[PDB]
RNA sequence: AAAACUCCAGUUGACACAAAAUAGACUACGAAAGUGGCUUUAACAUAUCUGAACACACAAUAGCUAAGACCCAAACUGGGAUUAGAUACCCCACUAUGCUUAGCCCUAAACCUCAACAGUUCAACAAAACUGCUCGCCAGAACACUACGAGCCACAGCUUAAAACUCAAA
């Protein structure tokens, strides 16, 4: 038993967490860029609870794009959520850039419980053509 | 390629040798060997199958002849003069059980 | 140019078609079917007109007719599609082939 | 005379393997079948090694899928979650 | 193979271009 | 099934563009490659981080955060142990795949023959 | 050989025999071999052609 | 040639839908068609949201229309469809049943592609 | 007097045909703890191994029953001018006798 | 964007393991081929270069698979020297 | 044969008189094309 | 890391004349250049072969003219870094240009550096070795994708293409 695949918005899945449906549970948007990760927390109706990033917490510069920084950011986000009453979170990932799992970890530490992880990293089906290949 | 005249055919991709042909060849080869033996000639059995090394050695022992079923060093025949003394009698015939 | 309401090269020999429904007739007409059927019809007509033995297509004459038809088709296509260069190329080569055939015939 | 062999049409040859989908007819209207050869998570079309199809068949499937995606019969960035409880044709790890 | 025969040619071409630009 | 190389390489026979243009000749050799490991690892960072945070929160003392520091130390020790264990293991006897040397030996025993 | 087809047919019908094949001793007779022999006995002069012949052979075996 | 019109309507009660159907068919007829059969494929939830012209939709009825028509009319038909309000989209594909399947013998096993390199000791 | 062709015709290896899934009998002639060297007639030997079920019964000389999965085990690889044989048959143990 | 929001490439978690779920997700991505694409779509890989890369890949696959097959064939032949002495 | 088949078909084609009713019928009914293949070569709905 | 941006960033809606994941472990179509989002229409010369460097029709990208579109990319240019210097490599910005329509230009490592058709089973590297037949081309290096002449919607161009001087090599 237990499916990997999520419960659809169509009815009726016999699941709740804190007496709430899957769609009702808030989303924590993690934007893992290559040199900073920003972690928003939002309700099901799209009301923002708590923004927090590696810039907002202390760090500046390349030290934004470490895992530790990401973790810290996540923790901060969790803390902010806690005041407003959240507990369980869906997680949504954007991009790659070390602070991606780290953010999640931070969130967990902060006390929020991870319910699901979905990465909507924008993979353009050939859209804009990116920067020229630099000399490393 | 160079065993196609001696092959009969192939039964489900498994090749079968012409037994008549083998017999014909055998009659020659064995006869030759016998002749060599008669003429006080050194016969040398050779192999590298391992499975049959012991057997070959035994065979060599039983007859007046010899064997070399082990790793063939570089120049047991071409360099003989050095690997043994200067006055060696090389094999006057050789037999491979496994070429 | 053959009329649009004419039957196909396929559904011509068959018997009952002469006294059949109108919709059915329309369905089995050049007007509905694609340009290739029309081309075929044209070829047939040409054969009827000119060649001594229709139902051959191995003799030079028949081949020439076909070539001519193809050329015509190409020309029609190139009325529009004036940037289509492949078709132009096809036309040009095909005309030369036709010319060659004609020469051979003459010889 | 008699007992020599006779050249003969290759017996014990088991008839060649089938696509699974060989006699079948694939339409963009049929989402089910098409859905079956898409990854549930990404909505990406499975390869040939994964799907296990003849080349013609595979091509037919892929074109059909594409048609569905444009003509609005099928989803694109995922495989429809109503069609997960169906026969698994494809050979795939993830989950273990 | 080498890229040694090409290089000379390239150089020559460049020089020619320069000359053209000048004059 | 291995992907075919039927009409792929630019050869005298083909009426095609080459599908592949390989810089090494596709003739599988009598060796297999050497094995690999490790990277910019940085073990036990999470453990470190919590301790650091605790320190920041307090004055800067051991006495306040003695239960986190100890944990961190333990983690470090474990990591150290694990490295040793790893060393003992994958160079001596791999559980699953073979050691490369053994594989090489095997290959040598039944080597590939293009040279006819 | 001409019996090969027959053997193949037998295999298709009746799975590779539960009777174990020897290979060590010469003149071993497998079930397939027996069937083939029966067929030979029947045709020539069975005269009923393939499927019918096969059926007849089967019947004989059963008896 | 035979054709299919993959019609995707609303989602707007029966009578309206019927009217729309009547309209579309009429247009086709005018263009020069012989419509053959009608195949309603339910009102299913649309696999993505699909933007008109002027409203964006989530639910939508599906209909297929089998029809013979002249080659020139198709573009016109398409244009008409584009113009018409209550169609979410109307793509027109030539009928699958036109193409008879070639009878497959099946996948054949491809061997090792051989004699790619010369006999050299290297 | 016999020919060769005739002999071939009425010999067990030709009587059977293809070796794929054919319950055959054959003796074991050599032993190294786990593995069992089994002769089943034919060109090569094969090896299977001692099962848990009556391991102390499979001794040198005894008869065993093989499933037989081909007679020779060969294959040609990327750069090979000839397929590389193993000199073994590949045949799975059913049991004894 | 115009699709439904929580179906594509989501992974549900059981009893708050989380890390495991993440790993699974990663694996899935790898299988699909998305991560690689993302890595490559960071910069524009010019057509010729792309083609070259593809060629390299396909050749590698051909080689590697063959090697694997060979290994499989030859794993039968690790036992012990059965004839030993000699 | 083909012609005959066509003729047979034709009586059931929608014309301007036999239209509204046909439409209504279509609306009422539902054909479905969603057959879904198994691992072996077999169809299921 | 400076600089840049804070009219910024994230979630959510609404949202293209740009570009077309996966399928593609397939190897197709075209004469080559080239061509993998979807639909419809039209549509892929030649029942011998070879054959224009006096023809005609094509010919990536870049480039020219004229008018449109302009997300993203980006020569040039500007700013920041780096360095003894940096007219580069790294960063950021932005333009011609890439796109559309109508004309030009006519070159590529235009290379699968392996001519067309018919047929067969060793210098060395590379993609084994050859027959028949045809056309094209080549005959020391460099001078020289030069000079002069000629033709070209090309005027800094393209195509064709020398000689001297030199050297015992390349
Ligand atoms: Mg190379
Ligand atoms: Mg010619
Ligand atoms: Mg020319
Ligand atoms: Mg611009
Ligand atoms: Mg820009
Ligand atoms: Mg465009
Ligand atoms: Mg151009
Ligand atoms: Mg030219
Ligand atoms: Mg090219
Ligand atoms: Mg060349
Ligand atoms: Mg030529
Ligand atoms: Zn098939």
Angle at F97 between CA F91 and CA F99, to 5 degrees: 35
CB of J61 closer than 8 Å to CB of F3: yes
Of C71, C16, C85, which is closest to residue C43 (Cα–Cα)? C71
Tokens of J59: 């050749």
Of C24, C26, C4, C5, which is closest to residue C16 (Cα–Cα)? C24
Helix, strand, coil share of chain D (percent; to 5): 30, 0, 65
Residues 6+ apart with CB under 8 A from G50: none
Of A121, A72, A65, which is closest to residue A98 (Cα–Cα)? A65
Crossing angle of helices C35-49 and C60-77, in 10° steps, is 140
Alpha helices (runs of H) in chain G, residue ranges in sequence order: 3-13, 31-42, 50-62
Please count the structural domains in chain D: 1
User: Residue F24, CB, less than 7 Å from strand L?
Assistant: no
Helix, strand, coil share of chain K (percent; to 5): 40, 0, 60
Q: Does I4 touch chain F (CB under 8 A)?
A: no
The CA–C1' separation of F12 and L47, in angstroms, is: 28
Experimental technique of record: cryo-EM
Tokens of H72: 């020139």
The whole-angstrom separation of Cα G24 and Cα C45 is: 79
Query: Which chains neighbour D (Cβ–Cβ under 8 Å, 3 or more pairs)?
Result: A, G, H, I, J, K
Helix or strand run (H / E) with residue F83? helix F66-90
CB of I13 closer than 8 Å to CB of G23: yes
End-to-end, the C-alpha distance of chain D in Å comes to 63
Residue F6: nearest nucleotide (C-alpha to C1')? L27
Strand L-proximal residues of A, range 58-117, CB below 7 A, are 61-63, 92, 94
The whole-angstrom separation of Cα C18 and Cα J36 is: 66
Of I14, I11, I26, which is closest to residue I91 (Cα–Cα)? I26
CB of D71 closer than 8 Å to CB of H91: yes
CB atoms within 10 A of CB D69: 20
The whole-angstrom separation of Cα C59 and Cα I94 is: 72
Residue with tokens 């039957």: C7
3-class secondary-structure state, position H12: coil
Residue C97: nearest nucleotide (C-alpha to C1')? L46
CB of D63 closer than 8 Å to CB of H80: no
CB of F47 closer than 8 Å to CB of F72: yes
Tokens of F42: 């940085």
Tokens of I78: 């990327």
Structural domain boundaries of chain H? 2-94
Identify the architecture of domain H2-94 in CATH: 2-Layer Sandwich (3.30)
CB of I79 closer than 8 Å to CB of I64: no
Residues 6+ apart with CB under 8 A from H47: D72, D73, D74, D75, D76, D80, J3
**DSSP assignment letter at G54:** H
The whole-angstrom separation of Cα C70 and Cα C43 is: 10
Neighbour-count burial of F65, counting CB atoms closer than 10 A to its CB (0-12 exposed, 13-18 middle, 19+ buried): buried
Question: What residues pack around ion ligand 1 (CB closer than 5 A)?
Answer: F 23
The whole-angstrom separation of Cα G9 and Cα B11 is: 18
Label the pairing between strands A27-33 and A88-94. parallel
Strands (E), D7-89: none
Label the pairing between strands B43-46 and B66-68. parallel
Closest partner residue to J8 among D42, D93, D95, by Cβ?
D42
The whole-angstrom separation of Cα A22 and Cα A19 is: 10
The whole-angstrom separation of Cα A88 and Cα A26 is: 7
The whole-angstrom separation of Cα H62 and Cα H20 is: 13
3-class secondary-structure state, position B87: coil
Per DSSP, the residues of H70-118 read -TTHHHHHHHHHHH-TTEEEEEEEE-GGGSPPP----PPPP------S-
3-class secondary-structure state, position I35: strand
Q: Please name every residue paired with B10 in a beta bridge, in sequence order, or none if there are none.
A: B15
Tokens of H110: 């491809």
CB atoms within 10 A of CB G37: 13
The whole-angstrom separation of Cα I95 and Cα I74 is: 26
Residue with tokens 């699901």: A116
Exposure string of H72-97, with b = 16+ CB inside 10 Å and e = fewer, is: ebbeebeebbeeeebbbbbbbeeeee
Per DSSP, the residues of chain E read --SHHHHHHHHHHHHHHHHHHH-
CA distances, B76 to each of B36, B72, B79, B96 (Å) = 21, 7, 6, 15
Q: Please name every residue paired with F94 in a beta bridge, in sequence order, or none if there are none.
A: none
User: Residue F25, CB, less than 7 Å from strand L?
Assistant: yes
End-to-end, the C-alpha distance of chain J in Å comes to 74
**Residue-number span of the structural domain to which D82 is assigned:** 1-96
CA distances, G23 to each of D12, I15, I26, I94 (Å) = 21, 10, 8, 17
The whole-angstrom separation of Cα C85 and Cα C87 is: 5
Exposure string of J22-60, with b = 16+ CB inside 10 Å and e = fewer, is: bebbbebbebbebbeebeebeeebeeeeeeeeebeebbe
Angle at D65 between CA D59 and CA D70, to 5 degrees: 130
Helix or strand run (H / E) with residue H47? strand H34-51
The whole-angstrom separation of Cα I25 and Cα F1 is: 33
Tokens of J39: 């890595």
Of A123, A50, A72, A125, which is closest to residue A93 (Cα–Cα)? A123
Of A120, A104, A99, which is closest to residue A32 (Cα–Cα)? A99
CB of A25 closer than 8 Å to CB of A87: no
Q: Which residues of G touch I6 (CB under 8 A)?
A: none
CB of J16 closer than 8 Å to CB of A89: no
The whole-angstrom separation of Cα C102 and Cα C94 is: 12
Instruction: Determine phi and psi for D62, rounding to 5 degrees.
Output: -70, -45
3-class secondary-structure state, position I89: coil
CB of J55 closer than 8 Å to CB of F10: no
Residue A36: nearest nucleotide (C-alpha to C1')? L9
Tokens of A60: 């500046």
Dihedral sign for Cα atoms in the order H67, H72, H73, H77: positive
Cα D38 to averaged position of ligand 2 atoms, centre (Å)? 50
Angle at J47 between CA J41 and CA J52, to 5 degrees: 95
What's CA A124's distance to the chain center, in Å?
A: 21
CA distances, J15 to each of A113, J21, J25 (Å) = 10, 11, 17
Residues 6+ apart with CB under 8 A from J6: A6, A9, A22, A23, A90, A116, A118
The whole-angstrom separation of Cα C36 and Cα C16 is: 24
Please count the structural domains in chain A: 1
Q: Does H75 touch chain K (CB under 8 A)?
A: no
Per DSSP, the residues of B6-67 read TEEEETTS-EEE-HHHHHHHHHHHHHHHHHHHHTT--EEEE---STTHHHHHHHHHHSS-EE
The whole-angstrom separation of Cα B2 and Cα B33 is: 24
End-to-end, the C-alpha distance of chain E in Å comes to 37
Helix or strand run (H / E) with residue C16? none
Of F62, I86, A123, D42, which is closest to residue J77 (Cα–Cα)? I86
The whole-angstrom separation of Cα F75 and Cα F25 is: 49
CA distances, A42 to each of A81, A84, D48, H11 (Å) = 9, 11, 41, 32
Residue with tokens 């009914």: K29
CB of H25 closer than 8 Å to CB of K13: no
Residues 6+ apart with CB under 8 A from A80: A41, A49, A50, A52
Of F101, F32, I84, B48, which is closest to residue J74 (Cα–Cα)? I84
Label the pairing between strands A131-132 and B7-10. unpaired
The whole-angstrom separation of Cα F43 and Cα F38 is: 12
**Residue-number span of the structural domain to which A106 is assigned:** 1-136
Helix or strand run (H / E) with residue H68? strand H56-68
CB of F33 closer than 8 Å to CB of J60: no
Q: Please name every residue paired with B7 in a beta bridge, in sequence order, or none if there are none.
A: B17
CB of A66 closer than 8 Å to CB of A50: no
Interchain pair D12, I18: CB under 8 A: yes
**DSSP assignment letter at D81:** G
Neighbour-count burial of D61, counting CB atoms closer than 10 A to its CB (0-12 exposed, 13-18 middle, 19+ buried): buried
Dihedral sign for Cα atoms in the order C49, C53, C54, C59: negative
Per DSSP, the residues of J15-82 read SS--HHHHHHHHHHHHHHTHHHHHHHTTEE--HHHHHHHHHHHHHHHHHHHHHHHHHHHHHTT-S--S
Chain I residue with Cα closest to J75: I86
Of F47, F99, F109, which is closest to residue F78 (Cα–Cα)? F47
The whole-angstrom separation of Cα D96 and Cα J11 is: 14
Crossing angle of helices A67-84 and A101-110, in 10° steps, is 40
């Amino acid at each position: 038993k237990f499916s990997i695949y999520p419960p659809i918005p169509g009815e009726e899945s016999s699941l709740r967490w804190a007496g709430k449906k899957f769609e009702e549970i808030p989303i924590a948007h993690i934007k893992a860029s290559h040199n900073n990760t920003q972690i928003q927390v939002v309700s099901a109706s799209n009301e923002p609870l708590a923004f927090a990033s590696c810039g907002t917490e202390g760090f500046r510069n390349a030290k934004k794009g470490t895992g530790i920084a990401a973790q810290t950011a996540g923790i901060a986000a969790a803390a902010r959520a806690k005041q407003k009453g959240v507990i369980h979170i869906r997680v949504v990932v954007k991009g790659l850039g070390p602070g991606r799992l780290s953010a999640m970890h931070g969130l967990i530490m902060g006390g929020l419980e991870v319910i699901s992880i979905t990465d909507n990293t924008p993979i353009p089906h050939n859209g804009c053509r990116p920067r020229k290949a630099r000399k490393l | 390629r160079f065993m196609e005249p001696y092959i009969f055919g192939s039964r489900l991709d498994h090749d079968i040798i012409d037994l008549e042909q083998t017999a014909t060849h055998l009659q020659l080869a064995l006869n030759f060997t016998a002749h060599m033996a008669y003429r006080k000639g050194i016969i040398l059995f050779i192999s590298r199958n391992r499975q049959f090394s012991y057997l070959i050695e035994n065979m060599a022992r039983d007859c007046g002849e010899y064997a070399h079923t082990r790793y063939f060093r570089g120049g047991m025949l071409t360099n003989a003069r050095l690997l043994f003394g200067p006055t060696v009698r090389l094999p006057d015939l050789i037999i491979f059980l496994h070429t | 140019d053959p009329p649009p309401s004419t039957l196909l090269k396929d559904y011509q020999n068959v018997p009952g078609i002469e006294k059949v429904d109108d919709v059915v007739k329309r369905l089995l007409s050049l007007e509905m079917a694609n340009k290739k059927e029309m081309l075929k019809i044209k070829q047939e007509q040409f054969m009827k007109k000119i060649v001594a033995n229709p139902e051959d297509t191995r003799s030079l004459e028949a081949r020439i007719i076909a070539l001519s038809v193809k050329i015509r088709s190409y020309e029609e296509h190139l009325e529009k599609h004036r940037k289509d260069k492949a078709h132009k190329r096809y036309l040009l080569m095909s005309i030369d082939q036709r010319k060659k055939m004609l020469k051979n015939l003459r010889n | 005379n008699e007992d020599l062999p006779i050249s003969m049409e290759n017996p014990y040859k088991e008839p060649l393997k089938k696509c699974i989908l060989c006699g079948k007819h694939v339409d963009y209207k049929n989402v089910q079948l098409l859905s079956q050869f898409v990854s549930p998570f990404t909505g990406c079309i499975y390869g040939r090694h994964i799907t296990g199809l003849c080349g013609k068949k595979q091509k037919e499937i892929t074109k059909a899928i594409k048609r569905a995606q444009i003509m609005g019969f099928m989803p694109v960035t995922y495989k429809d979650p109503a069609y997960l409880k169906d026969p698994k044709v494809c050979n795939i790890r993830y989950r273990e | 193979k080498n890229v040694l025969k090409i290089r000379r040619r390239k150089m020559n071409h460049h020089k020619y271009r320069k000359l053209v630009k000048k004059t | 099934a291995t992907p075919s190389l039927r009409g792929r390489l630019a050869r005298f026979g083909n009426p095609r563009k080459p599908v592949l243009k390989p810089n090494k000749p596709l003739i599988l050799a009598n060796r297999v490659g050497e094995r690999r490991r490790e990277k910019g690892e940085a073990t036990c960072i999470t453990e470190m981080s919590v301790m650091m945070a605790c320190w920041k929160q307090n004055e800067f003392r051991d006495d306040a955060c003695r239960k986190e520091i100890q944990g961190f130390l333990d983690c470090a020790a474990r990591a150290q142990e694990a490295r040793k264990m790893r060393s003992i293991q994958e160079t001596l006897g791999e559980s699953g795949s073979l050691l490369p040397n053994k594989l090489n030996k095997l290959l040598q025993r039944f080597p590939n023959k293009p040279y006819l | 050989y001409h019996e090969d087809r027959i053997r193949a047919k037998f295999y298709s019908v009746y799975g590779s025999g539960q009777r174990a094949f020897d290979l060590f001793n010469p003149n071993f007779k497998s079930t397939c071999q027996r069937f083939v022999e029966k067929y030979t006995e029947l045709q020539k002069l069975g005269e009923t052609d393939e499927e019918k012949l096969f059926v007849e052979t089967g019947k004989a075996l059963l008896a | 040639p035979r054709y299919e019109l993959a019609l995707i309507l609303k989602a707007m009660q029966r009578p309206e839908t019927a009217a729309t159907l009547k309209r579309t068919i009429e247009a086709l007829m005018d263009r020069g068609a012989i419509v053959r059969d009608l195949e309603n494929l339910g009102e299913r939830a649309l696999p993505y949201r699909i933007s008109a012209h002027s409203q964006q939709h989530n639910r939508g009825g599906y209909f297929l229309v089998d029809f013979y028509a002249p080659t020139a009319a198709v573009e016109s038909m398409v244009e008409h469809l584009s113009r018409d309000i209550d169609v979410i989209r109307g793509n027109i594909v030539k009928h699958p049943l036109t193409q008879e399947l070639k009878e497959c013998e099946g996948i054949v096993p491809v061997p090792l592609a051989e004699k790619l390199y010369s006999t050299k000791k290297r | 007097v016999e020919s060769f062709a005739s002999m071939l015709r009425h010999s067990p290896l030709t009587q059977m045909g293809p070796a794929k899934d054919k319950l055959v009998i054959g003796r074991i002639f050599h032993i190294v703890e786990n593995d069992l060297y089994i002769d089943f007639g034919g060109k090569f030997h094969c090896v299977c191994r001692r099962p848990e079920v009556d391991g102390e019964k499979y001794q040198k000389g005894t008869r065993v029953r093989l499933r037989l999965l081909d007679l020779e085990l060969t294959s040609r690889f990327l750069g090979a001018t000839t397929d590389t044989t193993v000199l073994e048959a590949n045949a799975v143990l059913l049991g004894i006798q | 964007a115009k699709h439904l929001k929580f179906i594509a490439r989501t992974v549900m978690v059981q009893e708050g393991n989380v890390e495991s779920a993440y790993r699974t997700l990663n694996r899935i991505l790898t299988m699909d081929g998305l991560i690689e694409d993302i890595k490559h779509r960071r910069y524009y890989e010019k057509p010729c270069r792309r083609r070259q890369r593809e060629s390299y890949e396909r050749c590698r696959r051909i080689y590697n698979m063959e090697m694997a097959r060979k290994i499989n064939f030859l794993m039968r032949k690790n036992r012990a020297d059965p004839w030993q002495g000699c | 044969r083909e012609v005959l088949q066509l003729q047979e078909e034709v009586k059931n084609f929608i014309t301007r008189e036999n239209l509204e009713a046909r439409v209504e019928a279509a609306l009422d009914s539902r054909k479905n094309y969603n057959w879904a293949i198994t691992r072996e070569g077999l169809v299921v709905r």
